[PDB]
């Protein structure tokens, strides 16, 4: 009794959703799309390489101008690169050498970093004195930060190892809203184009769609078998892709509330570190532990190409807003731009 | 190349100059990862959300790290050594300690990292086996056939170090080895032991690259 009645109700609810999800699976996305011409072979070549990092690169984020990017490394350095001229714009020292995330504000006036210090640090770049000074040191998370994304110059969402996500007011320095419901460590975080929702991928082999204003979970997605390391919304905003350690990408639909396709091959055993889509969403780019990246056809689950230029783990991967270039950062302390 | 971007190129050169000069400064320091449990007493090893302690022995830099299941352990892929602290007095939690040591020894990211292992609070073990109120043969039945290769204390000490060494020698193919030690609260020659152990760790890698041993 007591907890037994609640446990039985939870089990019945889970079975109902499974039946409800099955009632909408009239036709597989693979079946529908087996009439379109394949994209063929994608021949992307290393155009510009970025040197200067001495330790492993753990994160990288593009700018909204599609020219400046910021990268974080274990050497306690944040570097802002002018990708067109390979020039170094800034070299921000870090109080902690342990960083796992890096964010670049949409306005370009701020950058964010975090890691094992359990702190999101926000650096103001467009100041007087011609230097870069820390403007906010967000504290309150009891676990390591995995990912942080800027909403605007005043709001930021952080993913931590305390199985929770938070929304911060930078000026006040407080947690406006906390997000609870994950069982394992939350590893990834992607913002929707309309900014009103975001998805989080955690070590519980599940993904959750959250409402920023409401603060409550709306949809939970469970189709994986291992930890989820990467996540990324479809450009439309009605779908997202997740990468796991089981060597498998899956595309989930928000409205259908279930998986659509799986991206897997028998010769891939290594886990997935980072995923992102292209400008039109036709190409899904995933980084792996086997020193290279794969380009998937998002509608037919076919390997369109391979990005093989790194001799260590590809940790971070990003696609510009205009879709011109793709940036890959690896554990070999190198950043490569592909076109 | 215009006037401003030529000046921007010169700024990048100075940034590169500072990047390489302080990278050399960090190249001369040795990074250590401190691991243990609540009762291990790992804070009071070297008298000197992540806590960093620094100590220098014979003019070499040591930079210790303290964090506090382990998804971040891949960040410590290139540390000089791992320092593991175990409370030998607590017989009940020893089985937990061996399970943690086995987990940390066979980690996919630490297959080539040596471990310096400290049996902290060796005095509490001395004034517990002699009393005889608690017997370590209860939790591990095989202390029954005890032999030393007070004896009751020496065999008790050697049995515990053998339990940890057996896990270390089970796998690894000799790439990384353990350095058992016995310590106490009043002991002060601890940074020296890490100094001697870290010297052997570096020497062995130099020997391997010379294809000598």
């Amino acid at each position, epitope marked *: 009794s007591e907890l037994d009645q609640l446990r039985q109700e939870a089990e019945q609810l889970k079975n109902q959703i499974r039946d409800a999800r099955k009632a909408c699976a009239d036709a597989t996305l693979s079946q529908i799309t087996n009439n379109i011409d394949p994209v063929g072979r994608i021949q992307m070549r290393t155009r510009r390489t970025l040197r200067g990092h001495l330790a492993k690169i753990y994160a990288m984020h593009w700018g909204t101008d599609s020219r400046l990017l910021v990268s974080a490394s274990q050497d306690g350095k944040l570097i802002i690169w002018d990708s067109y001229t390979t020039n170094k714009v800034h070299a921000i020292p870090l109080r902690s050498s342990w960083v796992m995330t890096c964010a670049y504000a949409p306005s370009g006036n701020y950058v964010a970093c975090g890691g094992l210090d359990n702190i999101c640090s926000i650096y103001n770049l*467009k100041t007087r004195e011609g230097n870069v000074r820390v403007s906010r040191e967000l504290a309150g998370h009891t676990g390591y930060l995995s990912c942080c994304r800027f909403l605007d110059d005043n709001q930021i969402v952080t993913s931590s190892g305390d199985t929770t996500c938070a929304l911060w007011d930078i000026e006040t320095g407080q947690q406006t809203t906390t997000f609870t419901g994950h069982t394992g460590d939350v590893m990834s975080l992607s913002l929707a184009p309309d900014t009103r929702l975001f998805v989080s991928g955690a070590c519980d082999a599940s993904a959750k769609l959250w409402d920023v204003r409401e603060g409550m979970c709306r949809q939970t997605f469970t189709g994986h078998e291992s930890d989820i390391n990467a996540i990324c919304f479809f450009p439309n905003g009605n779908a997202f892709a997740t990468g796991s350690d089981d060597a498998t990408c899956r595309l989930f639909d928000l409205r259908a509330d279930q998986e659509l396709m799986t991206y897997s091959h028998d010769n891939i055993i290594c886990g997935i570190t980072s995923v992102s889509f292209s400008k039109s969403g036709r190409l899904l780019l995933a980084g792996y532990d086997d020193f290279n990246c794969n380009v998937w056809d998002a509608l037919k689950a076919d390997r369109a190409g391979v990005l093989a230029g790194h001799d260590n783990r590809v940790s971070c991967l990003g696609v510009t807003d205009d879709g011109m270039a793709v940036a890959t950062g690896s554990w070999d302390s190198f950043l490569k731009i592909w076109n | 190349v215009s006037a401003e971007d030529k000046a921007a190129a*010169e700024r990048s050169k100075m940034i590169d100059k500072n990047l390489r000069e302080d990278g050399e400064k960090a190249r001369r320091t040795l990074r250590l990862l401190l691991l243990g449990a609540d009762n291990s007493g790992k804070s009071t090893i070297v008298k000197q959300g992540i806590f960093e302690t620094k100590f220098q022995v014979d003019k070499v830099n040591f930079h210790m790290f303290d964090v506090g299941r382990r998804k971040w352990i891949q960040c410590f892929n290139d540390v000089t050594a791992i320092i593991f602290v175990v409370d030998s007095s607590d017989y009940n939690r020893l089985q937990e300690a061996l399970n943690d040591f086995k987990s940390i020894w066979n980690n996919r990211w630490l297959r080539t990292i040596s471990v310096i292992l400290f049996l902290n609070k060796q005095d509490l073990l001395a004034e517990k086996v002699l009393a005889g109120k608690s017997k370590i043969e209860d939790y591990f039945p095989e202390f029954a056939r005890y032999t030393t290769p007070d004896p009751r204390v020496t065999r008790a000490k050697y049995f515990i170090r053998k339990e940890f060494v057996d896990i270390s020698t089970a796998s690894g193919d000799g790439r990384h080895i353990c350095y058992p030690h016995f310590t106490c609260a009043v002991d002060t020659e601890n940074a020296r032991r890490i100094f001697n152990d870290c010297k052997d760790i570096i020497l062995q890698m130099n020997l391997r690259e010379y294809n000598l041993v």
Partner: single-chain antibody, 233 residues
């Protein structure tokens, strides 16, 4: 907070030597390239010398080359200008200008008070207007032309605008023909193409009067316009 305080100057006999010094206190002096700009007794604005951050690049105007020396003391947060064999043509107010150079930077942002010194293949930028009658609340357009196209092959056009109110050092308004300087009201705007540039001021008010100066940064020697004065009615 940011301040550039000048020192030196005075009455110097022709053929003498002098050493002007400007002290910087309030910003990262080491990371800033620095310029010297004079302004004749009652004439225009002329560039003199430049020293890069780290003292790795030094440029001089042809007038002062071989008899002017510019240096900086990073620990002392000061820069100097050692003048030798100075003549009557060197009598001017010597402004000291800070400048930084990266992508999206704002060079020539801060100017210091000048030093009054009294001695007893170039791009020509033409500001045809020299004085325009202006009524408050009206819209004012100032035109500028250059002998060479400032639009570079990288998409950046290197033209700058400055305002010098009476009794004050010039202040940056527009950098690269389109970007408002920090602290400049939104009523200022700039547009144009190579060889043809225009500064538009909407809803002109008080403290918006003075001399407006053009400048190129496409090629050293950096050169100014004559200057267009705005006066009341």
């Amino acid at each position: 907070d940011v301040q550039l305080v000048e020192s030196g100057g005075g009455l110097v006999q022709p053929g003498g030597s002098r050493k002007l010094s400007c002290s910087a206190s309030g910003f990262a002096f080491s990371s800033f390239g620095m310029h010297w700009v004079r302004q004749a007794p009652e004439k225009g604005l002329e560039w003199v010398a430049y020293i890069s951050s780290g003292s790795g690049t030094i440029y001089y105007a042809d007038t002062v080359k071989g008899r002017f020396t510019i240096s900086r003391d990073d620990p002392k947060n000061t820069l100097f200008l050692q003048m030798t064999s100075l003549r009557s043509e060197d009598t001017a107010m010597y402004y000291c200008v800070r400048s930084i150079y990266y992508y999206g930077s704002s060079p020539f942002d801060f100017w210091g008070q000048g030093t009054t010194l009294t001695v007893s293949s170039d791009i020509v930028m033409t500001q045809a207007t020299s004085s325009v009658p202006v009524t408050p609340g009206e819209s004012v357009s100032i035109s500028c032309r250059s002998s060479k196209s400032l639009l570079h092959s990288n998409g950046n056009t290197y033209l700058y605008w400055f305002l010098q109110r009476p009794g004050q050092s010039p202040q940056l308004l527009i950098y690269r023909m389109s970007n408002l300087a920090s602290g400049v009201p939104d009523r200022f705007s700039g547009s144009g193409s190579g060889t043809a540039f225009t500064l538009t001021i909407s809803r002109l008010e008080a403290e918006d009067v003075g001399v407006y100066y053009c400048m190129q940064h496409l090629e050293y020697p950096l050169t100014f316009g004559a200057g267009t004065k705005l006066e009341l009615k």
